[PDB]
Every structure is written in structure tokens, then in C-alpha cells.
Design a protein around this ligand. Structure first.
Ligand SMILES: CC(=O)N[C@H]1[C@@H](OP(=O)(O)OP(=O)(O)OC[C@H]2O[C@@H](n3ccc(=O)[nH]c3=O)[C@H](O)[C@@H]2O)O[C@H](CO)[C@@H](O)[C@@H]1O
Ligand SMILES: [Mn+2]
Length: 342
């Protein structure tokens, strides 16, 4: 099973940093061929990629024309270009190279030492559980003081598609390509019409980190959140672990029981670190206002996509807060997301 790393690039020479780390950590060239798809025609970025010679396969998006945006998107042509490139690059991977799957990595991401180990261990889970539609390296709330460094092996299921270093099966591309959007591809996949209740595996500690300060999007989201996501440094031999706990029939019984079996604690008590004998608690939210207030009070990303919170699963956001395991969760009667929660 050959799993290619598809690197998306355009006009940043710092794709160098991305490639150096991938190539440095790659355990097998044959198992993980690196295909760098470059859009934009930026000469310097092209030479940088070319300088790797046979270590990579350099392909170039063929259509550099400007894109006619809808009336509401004058300021967002960059996003149209990203979607068009993804469509072409992914089509190359699955139609031309004909690979059974691929790990998508943008040019401004640095991978952790166990990046490949992580994906070779979770690929079989993705293939065996159809309720899963991706494996992501990203923990949306993976800031340093919000993750347990003593559990770098801990993984989770999430309804919130993280992207940022993610594996998909050729089977999924078959589903998406026919209806691929003109822009904002990641938020589009977050919609239920695309997701269809499926989840991704995400880790306690991220296997990628971003340094792309300047890019298509403006730097506010990167400056206030993305730059703080910590890169895992301790190598975990995921291929030697039993990851059967991530299968739907085990996770939805065990993890949920764990969450709703945990004692409930007032958000204020958690914030000030009161009642420390409760090493694992549930902070229950009941409405949209309480969710965003409690989220903000504990330092969790508080925005919602199609009603789903960052790293949420059945509405539950799990993270570490001042050394305490916390599950910001809805009442046990939760029964599906509400896109009206914005
Ligand atoms: C951290 C985060 O959530 N980043 C997302 C953000 O991009 P973000 O705001 O991070 O913008 P970037 O500049 O990093 O561009 C994202 C990717 O698009 C490529 N690119 C850029 C310009 C262009 O004309 N052609 C092209 O192919 C870049 O090389 C890069 O690999 O929104 C994009 C969706 O719209 C997603 O793809 C990114 O994952
Ligand atoms: Mn970026």
C-alpha cells in the first residue's frame, strides 16, 4: 500500500522548510512518494522544488488564468485558485498516478517526527471503518498548555474536519470530485451534505504545525490561534499500538460513557482550578451562548462550522486545562448538530 504525500505549493520558497522535514523523517521513499503540485508559476519556488531532484515529483497546475468570481467574492479570488488547484492536484494523484489514498500537506506545514508512522498506523482504520472519512494530524485546540504531553499517543474521533495534514481514500475523492466547489473547499467539506455524519481521527498533540504567516488568508486567524498549535516532538510508534479503540462501535460506547460518567463541574471552578481532586470533568453547556462563553472562558477555539465546534465529537470538545482533563459537553440528550449555531 503506497501512500503518497501530496504537497500543495504556489509562490512561497519556504516550501523548502516543508520538504526538508518530510524528507528528513520519511522512513521509506517507496512507501511514501512525495508529489509536489505547484500552482502559480512562481519561478523561484519552482527552482527550489526542482533542486530536490529525484527526491520528489514536481507537477504544475496547467491553468494559470484568472478566475471569474461571483459578485460577493471580489476580495476572495485566492480561495477560488486554491480550490481549482486542489481539484487538479487530487485528480492527478487518483486518476493519473492512480494511488489508493494520499496525505495532503500544504507548503507551510512542518511535520512531526512521527508524521508518517502516524499515517501508516491509521490508514488501515480508515479503510476498515466507513464512518471515518479522514485521518488528520491536527488538533484544533492543540496549544501547549491545553494538551497532555505525557500522552503523545492518545488519539480521538472528531466531527470537525481539521485538514492541515490529512489522509483521504481514493473512495472519498470519488465522492467529492463530482461536486467540488468553486471556493472555500475546507468549510464546504464541513457541511453535512459532504460529511454525512462521518468523523476523522485527530491526535491529542498535533503532527503538523503551520508557519504560513503570510498567505492567501489574512494573518489574524494565524496570529491569534494557528501559530500556537504545538508540534509533537516525542516519537510514538503508532504502528506498534492497538488502535481498535478508535473504531465507531467501541469509541461511541466507551468514550461517551467516559465523558458522561465524569463528574460535572461549574465552569468557574475549572477556570480558577478549584476542586483539583477532580482530574477529569465535564463542563456542560446547554445553548449557543453558554457554549461560546464557556469555550472562551477556558481558551478553546469558539467558532463553529455548520454548527460543529472545533475538535468536537457529538458536540463534546475535549482538552487539557491547567492539568485537568476537561470535556466541554452538551447534555446527554444531544441528538445531532444545528447549523444555525454560528
Ligand atoms: C490553516 C488553514 O486552515 N489554512 C487553510 C486556508 O489557507 P491559508 O489561509 O492558510 O492560505 P495559504 O496561502 O497557506 O494557501 C493554502 C494552500 O493553497 C495553495 N495556493 C495558494 C494560492 C494559489 O493561488 N494557489 C494555491 O494552490 C498554497 O500553496 C497552500 O498550500 O484556507 C484554504 C481554503 O481556502 C485551505 O486550503 C487551507 O488549509
Ligand atoms: Mn497557510
Amino acid at each position: 500500500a503506497v501512500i503518497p504525500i501530496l504537497v500543495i505549493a504556489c509562490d512561497r520558497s519556504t516550501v523548502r522548510r516543508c520538504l526538508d522535514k518530510l524528507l528528513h523523517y520519511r522512513p521509506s521513499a517507496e512507501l511514501f512518494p512525495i508529489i509536489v503540485s505547484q500552482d502559480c508559476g512562481h519561478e523561484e519556488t519552482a527552482q527550489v522544488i526542482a533542486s530536490y531532484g529525484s527526491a520528489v515529483t514536481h507537477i504544475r497546475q496547467p491553468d494559470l488564468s484568472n478566475i471569474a468570481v461571483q459578485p460577493d467574492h471580489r476580495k476572495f479570488q485566492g480561495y477560488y485558485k486554491i480550490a481549482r488547484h486542489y481539484r487538479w492536484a487530487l485528480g492527478q494523484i487518483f486518476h493519473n498516478f492512480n494511488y489508493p489514498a494520499a496525505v495532503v500537506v500544504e507548503d507551510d506545514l512542518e511535520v512531526a517526527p512521527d508524521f508518517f508512522e502516524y499515517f501508516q498506523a491509521t490508514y488501515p482504520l480508515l479503510k476498515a471503518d466507513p464512518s471515518l472519512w479522514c485521518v488528520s494530524a491536527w488538533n484544533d485546540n492543540g496549544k501547549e498548555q491545553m494538551v497532555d504531553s505525557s500522552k503523545p499517543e492518545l488519539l480521538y474521533r472528531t466531527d470537525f474536519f481539521p485538514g492541515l495534514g490529512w489522509l483521504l481514500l481514493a473512495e472519498l475523492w470519488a465522492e467529492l470530485e463530482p461536486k467540488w466547489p468553486k471556493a472555500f473547499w475546507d468549510d464546504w467539506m464541513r457541511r453535512p451534505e459532504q460529511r454525512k455524519g462521518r468523523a476523522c481521527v485527530r491526535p491529542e498533540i498535533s503532527r503538523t504545525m503551520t508557519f504560513g504567516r503570510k498567505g492567501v488568508s489574512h494573518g489574524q486567524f494565524f496570529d491569534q490561534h494557528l501559530k500556537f498549535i504545538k508540534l509533537n516532538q516525542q516519537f510514538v510508534p503508532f504502528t506498534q499500538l492497538d488502535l481498535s479503540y478508535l473504531q465507531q462501535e467501541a469509541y461511541d460506547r466507551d468514550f461517551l460513557a467516559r465523558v458522561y460518567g465524569a463528574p460535572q463541574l461549574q465552569v468557574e471552578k475549572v477556570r480558577t482550578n478549584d476542586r483539583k481532586e477532580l482530574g477529569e470533568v465535564r463542563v456542560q453547556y446547554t445553548g449557543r451562548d453558554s457554549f461560546k462563553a464557556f469555550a472562551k472562558a477556558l481558551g478553546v477555539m469558539d467558532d463553529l462550522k455548520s454548527g460543529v465546534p472545533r475538535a468536537g465529537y457529538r458536540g463534546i470538545v475535549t482538552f487539557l486545562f491547567r492539568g485537568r482533563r476537561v470535556h466541554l459537553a452538551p447534555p446527554q440528550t444531544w441528538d445531532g448538530y444545528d447549523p444555525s449555531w454560528t
